[PDB]
């Protein structure tokens with residue numbers, strides 16, 4: 001089984017196999033926190049009880065992640081496929097996944113400024129850079145969403161990175177309906193503009209502080225809503241310029257939507273506008 005990315009073909013043999021003795025599991029997080037000799041790592045494990053397909057899936061996932069080279073995509077430290085159970089070793093992202101972080105770190109009476117608008121813009125900017133990298137390398141992610149993003153740490157130095165490529169893995173060889181543009185439902189045509197649409201939904205998730213998109217709508221209701229021109233309202237307290245980026249991401253015609261270079265440019269503008277970043281987030285009770 002080969003994998004083609006950018007200007008290079010690669011196989012299992014090119015994967016950096018780490019001697020099993022050098023790998024220690026520290027605790028569960030099927031993922032564990034681990035150590036390699038000392039590098040902190042996350043360990044994704046393939047269950048020994050699985051089918052042939054699970055094994056090629058696991059292998060293709062390792063190939064995919066191992067070929068990426070960008071600071072906003074989680075690194076693959078290596079693999080251990082010659083011992084059971086098989087491991088994929090990933091950069092350990094201590095802040096956890098983005099969706100959970102937004103829900104746990106919402107401004108509250110016990111910590112009214114735990115998070116501010118600039119923090120959310122930096123996360124959006126980080127993922128957008130990741131996405132620009134995928135775009136310019138002609139890789140379509142297909143599942144951009146907060147559940148698939150990770151943070152290096154809880155505190156103010158945090159960096160957001162794209163952390164899961166399972167959907168792209170399957171496609172290479174379960175539509176995330178609420179993150180999908182109209183043409184995906186009706187034409188099944190996918191483009192980097194597909195990711196642009198998803199990023200807009202991700203933006204909404206971020207600035208809502210981790211709400212489910214289209215609150216109160218089922219998948220089919222969303223599908224009909226969006227196909228007929230409907231769009232989400234801004235998240236509570238969302239700055240007008242940030243909502244504008246979302247709605248630009250959600251233009252009905254793919255070609256009307258910005259590429260990620262333009263998105264990054266507009267997020268930076270937002271970061272430079274004091275009227276945006278001086279906006280307070282809602283305090284939750």
Ligand SMILES: COc1ccc(F)cc1[C@@H](C)Oc1cc(-c2cnnn2C)cnc1N
Pocket residue numbers: 029031042044074090091092093094095096097147148149150162163164
């Ligand atoms: C549930 O796992 C995921 C969820 C979403 C993703 F995008 C990637 C992963 C997995 C494959 O990767 C990591 C997980 C964590 C983590 C999660 N919760 N706490 N921690 C400490 C840290 N670093 C990773 N590399």
